[PDB]
Amino acid sequence: EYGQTQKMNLFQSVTSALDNSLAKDPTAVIFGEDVAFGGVFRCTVGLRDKYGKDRVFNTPLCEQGIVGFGIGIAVTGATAIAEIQFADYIFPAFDQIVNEAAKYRYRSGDLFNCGSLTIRSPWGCVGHGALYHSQSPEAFFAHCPGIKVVIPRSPFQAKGLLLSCIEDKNPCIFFEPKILYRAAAEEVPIEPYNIPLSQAEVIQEGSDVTLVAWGTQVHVIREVASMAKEKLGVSCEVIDLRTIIPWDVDTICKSVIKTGRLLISHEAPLTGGFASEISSTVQEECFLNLEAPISRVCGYDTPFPHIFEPFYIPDKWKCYDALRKMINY
Amino acid sequence: EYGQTQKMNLFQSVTSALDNSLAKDPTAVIFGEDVAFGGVFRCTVGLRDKYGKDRVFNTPLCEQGIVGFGIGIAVTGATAIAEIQFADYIFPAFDQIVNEAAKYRYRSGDLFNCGSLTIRSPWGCVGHGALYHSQSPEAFFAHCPGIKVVIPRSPFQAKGLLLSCIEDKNPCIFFEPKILYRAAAEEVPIEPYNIPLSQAEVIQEGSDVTLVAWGTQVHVIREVASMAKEKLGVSCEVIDLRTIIPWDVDTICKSVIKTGRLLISHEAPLTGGFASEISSTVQEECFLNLEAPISRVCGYDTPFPHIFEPFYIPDKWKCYDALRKMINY
Amino acid sequence: KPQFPGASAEFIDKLEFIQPNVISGIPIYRVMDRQGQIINPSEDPHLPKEKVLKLYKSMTLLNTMDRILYESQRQGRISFYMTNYGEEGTHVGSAAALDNTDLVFGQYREAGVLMYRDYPLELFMAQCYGNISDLGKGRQMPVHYGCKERHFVTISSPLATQIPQAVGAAYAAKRANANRVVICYFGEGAASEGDAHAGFNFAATLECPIIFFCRNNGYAISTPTSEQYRGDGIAARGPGYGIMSIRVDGNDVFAVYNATKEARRRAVAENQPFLIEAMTYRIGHHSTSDDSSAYRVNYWDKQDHPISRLRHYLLSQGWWDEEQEKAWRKQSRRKVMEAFEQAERKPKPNPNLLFSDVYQEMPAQLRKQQESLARHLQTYGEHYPLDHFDK
Amino acid sequence: KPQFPGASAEFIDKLEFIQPNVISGIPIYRVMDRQGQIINPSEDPHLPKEKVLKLYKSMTLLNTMDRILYESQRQGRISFYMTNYGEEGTHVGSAAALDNTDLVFGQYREAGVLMYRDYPLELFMAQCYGNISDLGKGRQMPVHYGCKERHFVTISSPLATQIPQAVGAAYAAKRANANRVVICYFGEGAASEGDAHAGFNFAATLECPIIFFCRNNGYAISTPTSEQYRGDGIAARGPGYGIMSIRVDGNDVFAVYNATKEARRRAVAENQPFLIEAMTYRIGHHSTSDDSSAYRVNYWDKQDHPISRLRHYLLSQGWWDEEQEKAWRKQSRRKVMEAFEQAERKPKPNPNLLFSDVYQEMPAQLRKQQESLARHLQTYGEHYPLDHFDK
Numbered sequence A, B: 001e002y003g004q005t006q007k008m009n010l011f012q013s014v015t016s017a018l019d020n021s022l023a024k025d026p027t028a029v030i031f032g033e034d035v036a037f038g039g040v041f042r043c044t045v046g047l048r049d050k051y052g053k054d055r056v057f058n059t060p061l062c063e064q065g066i067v068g069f070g071i072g073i074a075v076t077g078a079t080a081i082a083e084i085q086f087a088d089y090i091f092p093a094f095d096q097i098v099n100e101a102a103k104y105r106y107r108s109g110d111l112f113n114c115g116s117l118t119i120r121s122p123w124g125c126v127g128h129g130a131l132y133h134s135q136s137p138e139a140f141f142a143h144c145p146g147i148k149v150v151i152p153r154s155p156f157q158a159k160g161l162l163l164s165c166i167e168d169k170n171p172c173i174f175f176e177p178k179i180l181y182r183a184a185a186e187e188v189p190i191e192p193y194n195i196p197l198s199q200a201e202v203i204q205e206g207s208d209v210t211l212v213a214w215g216t217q218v219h220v221i222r223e224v225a226s227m228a229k230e231k232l233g234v235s236c237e238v239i240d241l242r243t244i245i246p247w248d249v250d251t252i253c254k255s256v257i258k259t260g261r262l263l264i265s266h267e268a269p270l271t272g273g274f275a276s277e278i279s280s281t282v283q284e285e286c287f288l289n290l291e292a293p294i295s296r297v298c299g300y301d302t303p304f305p306h307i308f309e310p311f312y313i314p315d316k317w318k319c320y321d322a323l324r325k326m327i328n329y
Numbered sequence C, D: 001k002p003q004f005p006g007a008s009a010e011f012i013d014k015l016e017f018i019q020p021n022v023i024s025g026i027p028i029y030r031v032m033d034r035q036g037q038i039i040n041p042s043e044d045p046h047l048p049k050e051k052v053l054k055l056y057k058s059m060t061l062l063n064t065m066d067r068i069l070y071e072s073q074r075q076g077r078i079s080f081y082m083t084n085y086g087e088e089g090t091h092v093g094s095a096a097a098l099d100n101t102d103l104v105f106g107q108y109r110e111a112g113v114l115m116y117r118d119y120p121l122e123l124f125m126a127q128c129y130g131n132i133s134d135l136g137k138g139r140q141m142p143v144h145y146g147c148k149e150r151h152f153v154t155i156s157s158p159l160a161t162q163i164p165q166a167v168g169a170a171y172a173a174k175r176a177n178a179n180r181v182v183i184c185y186f187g188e189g190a191a192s193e194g195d196a197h198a199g200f201n202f203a204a205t206l207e208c209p210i211i212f213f214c215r216n217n218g219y220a221i222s223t224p225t226s227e228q229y230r231g232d233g234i235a236a237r238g239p240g241y242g243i244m245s246i247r248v249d250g251n252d253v254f255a256v257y258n259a260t261k262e263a264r265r266r267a268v269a270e271n272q273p274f275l276i277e278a279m280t281y282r283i284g285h286h287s288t289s290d291d292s293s294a295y296r297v298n299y300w301d302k303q304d305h306p307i308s309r310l311r312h313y314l315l316s317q318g319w320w321d322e323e324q325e326k327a328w329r330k331q332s333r334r335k336v337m338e339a340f341e342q343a344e345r346k347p348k349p350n351p352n353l354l355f356s357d358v359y360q361e362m363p364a365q366l367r368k369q370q371e372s373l374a375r376h377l378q379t380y381g382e383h384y385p386l387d388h389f390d391k
């Protein structure tokens, strides 16, 4: 495919995307809490030694500062790759992201921009992260015109999507599913390559039902697809959304026009979750093809619990049962 | 109805709700930027003189501080009525609202709570507020279990709903449509009264289509209802949602089961706006009754512009045209 | 000797709390008195006549424009305005000390910096009217100016957000060996925001060439400083972050100039932040939305005004007179009125422009919404003010 | 004399920038040396034997519990842990100076405060295991303790959020004439957050009876203080907000005690905030998720440890000996092990409890989701660890 590859898990593919970026773009800098020694998930190991202390460095412990600082770097045209240590701690920077980064180009009539900013952050459940190490905040950002929000499902996908975020001329939030950081490795090009933003990927074709998810939850719906085939004789089309905003409306709609049924799943809570935006759009576009109501299989409308995690998450059984009801509707 | 009433516009009904509250609840305090002299919209005029400088007071200019401070007052059991000067400036406090206020009771197993906190803030378009004096942030808060979000359409409604927020044992955000502050007065009880939270109000019965909105936009859909009747012979049921979360699912669904058609409208941008949550829920619950796709008539997916405001907002013509297409579907 | 990594300090064997000294705080640096006389000759910057006349003419031209735009807002011709009365000295004294290409971030009450940099009257006007000439495309509220050519970052309403941003620009400047400073203006109210604490700290730890310039004008809208802080103003906070700090009489253009000039030299040379707190008084209302009589001026307007103080200096030096004052008042009025008339005659921009620049490229779904408005206007256009807008 | 409303100050006629003094910062207050000898008798608090033995036994019982829970996490028995090594003196010295009903807000590394207040071993255990006895219902990560009976506000992971909250509680206490102080603990890293700047400022302007207590232990995870700030630590920031401030040797229980006692008296009497920066060293890893060898201890563990320093004091006074040390080590181990065994035997709480307390009353739509899980478990229960959970 893309020159020489090597086996990488997700943390290593992130390190490789970042190394590629600082090798080819002399303006690029990487900064945040504890990034200098390699980061608490080891995503920046080696980079300070390779590229210098002025390019990979620790900031003070202040998320509103990190994002404000990165916007300012990007205003000058330099590539700024900010890290927020867990996506749960992105909220102190919410005003800098929503009122500042997202609106920077528009409000200046394109005199100024912070296009060269990317914010990367660990995201999603991790077994025992509880309320503040498990969150999936993408729906809070989906309602903010002017930012992009991108979430990969695997090492190959992560490196391609992150490089696209870094290079894209708009402020981007890149959420890394932390439960995948040391999951199975796969072949990843050593050299840079890009995967397009605002493009969903149909990873398995099918004819009876369309399943949509992102991040780790893609792997859950792939397993649900295999259960439906074996237990029900049902052919499921499985789509990784990849980009939360702007999202690939056309690919999802085309699939649902074919299948007539849609199930969307995400770890984030149901109410106000991004599944509502996908559901209400597909319903408007595909209304005449819908054989059953669009299903949403999500986290409960509660904070993310410590000891009850196994009961909280939208697992393959929850998703299977929902799919079973939808096919019988 | 409720003892002696007097004519009040919306700012005056707010002053009256707050005066009632500090008269009957000795713990209650009111605080924020510029509240001591009466506030920049005059909602707290007279209260410092009446109740004392320790009860109605100015804070430093720091929204994360205002909300953190109010949570702390409420942790002790005292009623804390925080003001955020424009809803556009609520974002610095987003971490204190989402990670702290909303999760306070849950995460402590009910050992501690901040139930006695209310945050009130001017909200919605105002003719020339541009990007930072016009916002409608309710969808950002809708995705956060543990808070309530309430928006009134009129002076009588505002006083009843605000008193319910103040008294409710959960942290509440009360958004005041600032374009209504000095709009037409109506009769408002001088003494306290309550309007229930999580209850929509059907303000006009109809049989062909259900229209849902909140705040100022309720008045727009009421006028659209009168246009549809005159121009199309269409009977519209008009519902004020009132509470954004937790919202009155049953009332909306019952209406749509009757009419078979639903149009939802809100000034906030379409994508990730709260209309998606209402649409996707009604679609799941009422699927077999839907005669046409659920319509959403919203602000565009852009920041809120200065000179282009007349073109941006989901006005009665935008809503009428959508309704016309839906009835012809 | 203590071995703790967190501080460099001796032991002490008596319990003694450090007491803030507020009653006798950081002294206010002043070069000329209220009569425009130099107090200490060794501090006199001895600026050349033509530059001092530029300070003066910039301040008065801004005053002229303020008077006209304020009145234009009261007549319903622009939606909003904020005047700069009493603070014009902090603007031009500091701008005069900068290189043309030093990057400026501001709050909203620093228009004199753009004036000093020769920003055209036409473009101040175009932004307040949101007309076709506005490079901001009419998207923001009046007085939210920006100019890429004159290195003045577009103003935004949320307070203090520009502070950590200016620090990041300063870092990038350091890496590029730009040999330029960033200056970042804000009010004493805005200094209360969490962003100020982030900016100050990041500037010192990351060693950034930046001047933090605080206009302390005694009020944040209705809020007096006794309710804003209890420390010795904003200057007293700088040293705690490791920032070289100074307090200046901001109604004295020379004191402001001298402090900004020295800060700029050292910040760019040493890659180190400086804080200047300019003490002034907010003569006008907070904005056209504020009636300051609801909560509180002529002492300041008549005794200690930056324009009066520099005029006296100019009269004392024989560099200005009544005849020159009279002729300049007249010509600057005429220049402002000419820009004003031209600005009111222009249409507003094409309504399509509400959709571009959200992202660099318009997403397909956003183009669809743009197309939806076009179709809407074809049917319902008579209900919209289309004749005010370019077509 | 300057007339500016923003500061109280004289004029000065020479340009002079205020320079931070970092090399020789705020001195570190110390009552006993590393040999447990009193340095200045007039500072000796002469606490009675039984209270000093409580300080010591609280510190060592916490150390015993840390060792056992750390090892329990390495064995996979609890999901997470954070030790308190080297900082046990800041905890008990300060708690000893408080009234039982003074309200505490914390960060996560102040468990000794709860120990000192006689929080049962069973409930430290129950929270780490998330078992049926946990009053937090197993909802939060381990070490996120809370106790309403002992006035210790439930810990939360987001840093510094408790700071402006503690200030609000202190305000409410003032209004109620509670005659109580609030104390608010945080690390030197957390002091970088915008919330710290909000809390400090609101406390001084609103005149609140609160003690801000900063543990400065030289690291915030991997980040050394040279990268956290460039000012003279956290103590040097207090005066700029108008806060009485002091720096203490936090490995000296008496220095910590004396500073907390005096701050409490004055804060409650005057309704005024105090800041204490306790200088210490983080002996352990940041948490069980951290391997500190990746970025950096025995100097501190062996030369300057709060427990060793107080033991020496106790041995010097003839108030403890080898036989007492040996017997106490044994009994506290046995008490911790007894709580531990009991905690591991208990089931986790009923899974329904994941839904309650989101709001006070469960909304109807939330009850519907609760009902949906119950129905789900009736069909698919064999795929869930139901036998670990109450029924």
Ligand SMILES: Cc1ncc(C[n+]2csc(CCOP(=O)(O)OP(=O)(O)O)c2C)c(N)n1
Residues within 6 Å of the ligand: B033, B061, B063, B085, B089, B092, C109, C157, C158, C159, C186, C187, C188, C189, C190, C191, C215, C217, C219, C220, C221, C282, C286
């Ligand atoms: C985050 C935020 N909160 C509140 C406001 C509303 N506001 C606009 S200006 C202002 C006062 C600012 O005072 P100061 O910084 O002292 O500047 P000055 O107007 O006195 O020059 C306030 C509260 C805002 N723009 N942004």
Ligand SMILES: Cc1ncc(C[n+]2csc(CCOP(=O)(O)OP(=O)(O)O)c2C)c(N)n1
Residues within 6 Å of the ligand: A033, A061, A063, A085, A089, A092, D109, D157, D158, D159, D186, D187, D188, D189, D190, D191, D215, D217, D219, D220, D221, D282, D286
């Ligand atoms: C807002 C936020 N950002 C980041 C974190 C991740 N984090 C948990 S503890 C920690 C270091 C805190 O250091 P310090 O305050 O010095 O306390 P210490 O652990 O040294 O006692 C960090 C960065 C968090 N919990 N909250």
Ligand SMILES: [K+]
Residues within 6 Å of the ligand: A115, A116, A117, A118, A165, A166, A167, A168, A169, A170, A171, A172
């Ligand atoms: K980017």
Ligand SMILES: [K+]
Residues within 6 Å of the ligand: B115, B116, B117, B118, B165, B166, B167, B168, B169, B170, B171, B172
């Ligand atoms: K409430």
Ligand SMILES: [K+]
Residues within 6 Å of the ligand: C106, C107, C155, C156, C157, C158, C159, C160, C161, C162
């Ligand atoms: K700003």
Ligand SMILES: [K+]
Residues within 6 Å of the ligand: D106, D107, D155, D156, D157, D158, D159, D160, D161, D162
């Ligand atoms: K906390």
Ligand SMILES: [Mn+2]
Residues within 6 Å of the ligand: C187, C188, C189, C215, C216, C217, C218, C219, C220, C221, C282
């Ligand atoms: Mn001010």
Ligand SMILES: [Mn+2]
Residues within 6 Å of the ligand: D187, D188, D189, D215, D216, D217, D218, D219, D220, D221, D282
């Ligand atoms: Mn630390």
